[model samples]
Target chain A: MLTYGAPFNFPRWIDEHAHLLKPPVGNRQVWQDSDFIVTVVGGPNHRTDYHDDPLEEFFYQLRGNAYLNLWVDGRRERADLKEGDIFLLPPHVRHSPQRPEAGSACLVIERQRPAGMLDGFEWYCDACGHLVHRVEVQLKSIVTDLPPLFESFYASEDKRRCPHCGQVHPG
Target chain B: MLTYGAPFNFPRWIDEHAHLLKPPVGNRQVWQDSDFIVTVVGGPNHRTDYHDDPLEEFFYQLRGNAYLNLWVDGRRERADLKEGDIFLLPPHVRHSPQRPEAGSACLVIERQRPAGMLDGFEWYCDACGHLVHRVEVQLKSIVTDLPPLFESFYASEDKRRCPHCGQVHPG
Candidate 1:
């Protein structure tokens, strides 16, 4: 178990960032050099845009429900999930999220590895140079909204970059 | 990761049971122990009798679905599951598995811990235990019926029990 989902010990390296967010928000805990962020959403009600960024993202529902609206090319689709369910988003994928019909207390895992995208909706695949959708972008959007409701969230906090491999997290 | 599922680097101190089970039925290689037995089921099929002898078990799903059926009073019920899932069976828990219509391929984990039934089943509260059916038995029946099959596939050949700790490992 590279990571214990539950009963096992969560790394002692946990640093709480829940206090950093504004009202009507939840809690955030960082681990492993801020390469990962785990957030517990509480009474969250907001909307965000579709922007491409780098990072690997996995969303797990611990309590409550969530609606993730995914926009690809121009088509928008929604994912309705509940506790015990998980969703994954590739890097540079055009997607957005909102509370929609249900409110959730969720856990979001934000990884530092980017979608390896440079600067476009069409993610430049390093392996094949093919412009493809990146999922990490969706993870970033789900982590914190752009023009964040809480100013201290991102674009201001010390951007976490993996020092060992020069891999920028949440690209 | 307390216990890496697989493909990850498990600790060097803890021996890797790499050859304990066949792999993916051929998407890769298969090198299982001739003594310890494991199977990838379509679903939880039947009830598994209890054993006081001691055993360590684990389950992980590669695809499809199933439920984790646990003992209640004198009966068992389902616990839901899906892909990339993992479950551990402490020794001596009266339990069985039930697979739904979808069917599944699971990666079952079995271990030989230091203490036999010491780490066995979680004793539910008395009320819960009374509501669930608990049975005690072993694989003696199989040896009685198909002797060769039991000997070749399920029987124990090596006596690897620990005198100090009583941990029966696959040596």
Candidate 2:
């Protein structure tokens, strides 16, 4: 549901979701007021693909530390974000937020796609820097709309195996 | 100077502002892109004044415990936010953010006012809870602009003294 016309004003206690922030239930949508969308994401997120769209995103670690992986200059680089920390990611960076610990959780804030902007999800070889797969879409609701793309990519071996390198992306 | 036009994409380490975050420097501006302004404020803030603006603000405690005081229903109320905790304040709530210890620091997020929307700085009687004084003005930059208003308000005894109730606000 969109929270544009009527905005919610309440304190988002980052620790309140400590229990449900693990495993399958992963992230909780905080709000979608104006252009910004707030989310609290849990650990053990096995995202092999990187979001390659042109947009700025803010990340804050609430409980445990996490490494924010980004594909810059065709190489996978990581920025360590510790608890009680916040980082603003720039636009057009192929980024993948990874949480290795189950108890770790992070606060993520980003904007909804403006008018004609489209979201692109791409994959790169973890061992060698090479393009693995790519997909473009005009996203609506991330909760109900975005997960299907991940499934579609992992289901095909054609997308998982990097053509430039003989590396197969792990699920 | 504004951070607009050419935006910088770098991770904002919230702890990087710790040493200079104490008294004298107080708060550091993180960024101002689009409608949001992010700041990291230090402890021992002597602001007894409340800002009665019709805008929603988000608060997060990084190091120690602080409070968001809401003067609602003609009484003082508090929303306690400790370290690693986040609180989203509702709009139109007369609120004051307090910090006591020098080691305490908080990350605050607020939206820039829209066109014709003015920011309000106010105070309430500590005893009788009467309206002390309020000044409305459009803020361009808090670092380069807003502190002058605080100086101007504190310079005049007429602005700090409560008229509805015979009480002089603490300096």
Candidate 3:
């Protein structure tokens, strides 16, 4: 017989695994079903890069605050997220979350991307605000896949350079 | 063009639409994506019956406590939920929720059931604990379809009677 529902100690899960979040952004997947997945994420201050997701994402703040910057209606807009705030992002939208210097944590819920759909990341020039670099990836596991993607962007000076404005992202 | 994610005010939505939930059990849908659906439910005291679901359900408590009774390991068990608590129910499980007389409210999330998959409800006799009545329902809309299922169970005295023990449920 299949087991029914169970209670999850969410705040404890974050406390026990807080060591995993060493320096940059870190996330731990707490639960997953066939379609739904939940992840607890926390990290240091990070630059903003637009992310294009294949599924709608829901965020619930557990600790600290962050600004979810999005490219909406041909301009940049932001959603201010404080502790206990909830926000939702539609699929295929470009968003970049700015984590605070004091550190931040949030719970994100999203559907599993269907076959053939891909996730993307792009950086806009700080000086001229033009699109600089774009990276497309097929997400297999978020905890395993995301760190490397961030590392790739930070490691490549060419990736950080804005050709249009001749400015480099200060990492 | 498809719209991207948008922010929703949960408290405001509930306050503005409190009229819709005037009677007893009421629910208002807050968000729906391609694969996920979220509904906020508020209701009065309710009985516990076995529910066989085709999809996994996620519950987050907002207002009051709810005791979720589950038929697990050939026996009945329960999970107590308080405000800010979260629980996840696996797919195809037989479970029922017991609400309080003071009333309760919760946010529920689940994947859209696949085509041809249906939901089921069953009542076990209070005296002998044997299966008494069963109903199969296709949930086209949660707000529209769920209320009638409860009405059906309450309307029929035969459905509440136990043949083995000559006992009827006091509803």
Candidate 4:
């Protein structure tokens, strides 16, 4: 991790890191590297994985709207965050944040994973809401490491297709 | 410390915790009590002491405008954050955050102090730009613990008054 020794004006920070906030490179702009991993993410993002972790995450809608789709019990529930709104995801909740608009962005705050703790990422069926595939890893870098794993999951039809519901995950 | 097992919608959280955000108690609503201490503070606030700590703090203007007063090289500087604006204060800087408006509120994020890491609270002379007084303490709780120390500082004229220029701080 990197330590930031300067102040960040959000809009200016976004502009300075514009090149990194696009697809194939993840739509997230990570400017603060510290104990708390702070980032501004822009989207049209729909990754199929829901993050299950020990630490809770903070979210604030900076520019536009985003939906934090959650898997509660066995169903999907959404908490919409409009611009200027803020939300905190409780720990251990399976959550996948989505921003459908391309111009939309959100500020996300999370703690650096503690040593020996693991993060679980899972994909569930859209139709029956059953588990499709699940993977556990030490999620060190979301932008650098997670996307390739997402790509690999998308490539495998056996993983994307749910055994429980036979519903294919449209990646 | 409290572990939140539910999601927080900022406005709802503010409304629910309104009683905690007032004077004598402190105009700060602490909703999350994890590693990253998450809280929303309302003010017409002014504190003479500037905080010098090793951990960086994240500040977001939630409802109104506020000025972050800084003491740099024994000189005072200001960084204003309007509503919806965000700023990250670098580590080890002497900063005093003041929200002059009564209806103004801000979201502040800070790391929980590690064992033996002391946070220094110092007073600087407004006229001569000289040191007035300073106290280092292990900040276990910002709301429940710090106000009495601030009251002690205000009660002592010798501490409030500048040793060099003799300009007393108007607390």
Instruction: List candidate 2 segments past 4 Å from native.
Output: A1-19, A30-36, A52-55, A62-65, A73-76, A82-85, A111-118, A124-142, A155-171, B1-19, B31-36, B52-55, B73-75, B112-117, B125-132, B158-171
Off by over 4 Å in 3: A1-5, A8-25, A32-34, A101-103, A157-171, B1-23, B32-35, B101-104, B157-171
Candidate 1 segments exceeding 4 Å error:
A1-24, A30-34, A100-103, A114-171, B1-170
Number of the predicted model whose DockQ against the real structure is largest: 3
lDDT of 4 by residue, B62-105 (tens): 77788878866556777787876777777778888877776667
**Could you give candidate 2's per-residue lDDT for residues A68-101 as a string of tens digits?**
6776565657777776566666677777777888
* lDDT digits (tens) for residues A48-137 of candidate 3: 678899777877777777778888876887877777666767777788877663446777887677778899988887678888888888
Sort candidate 2 into its docking category: incorrect
DockQ of every predicted complex = 0.05, 0.09, 0.39, 0.27
**lDDT of predicted model 4:** 0.74
Which of the predicted structures, 1 or 2, would earn the higher DockQ when compared with the native?
A: 2
DockQ of 1: 0.05
> For candidate 2 chain B, which ten residues in a row score worst on lDDT?
B1-10
Instruction: Tell me which of candidates 2 and 3 scores higher on TM-score.
Output: 3
Ranking by DockQ: 3, 4, 2, 1
Comparing 2 with 3 on lDDT, the higher-scoring candidate is 3
List, residue by residue over A36-150, the lDDT tens digit for candidate 4: 6787788777766898877777877777777877876666777777876776676778888877766666888887787777888888887887889988878787567677778
TM-score of each: 0.34, 0.72, 0.82, 0.78
**Model 1: how far residue A6 lies from native, Å:** 11
Worst-scoring 10-residue span by lDDT in model 4 chain B: B1-10
- Of 1 and 3, which scores higher on DockQ? 3
Candidate 1: chain B TM-score equals 0.41
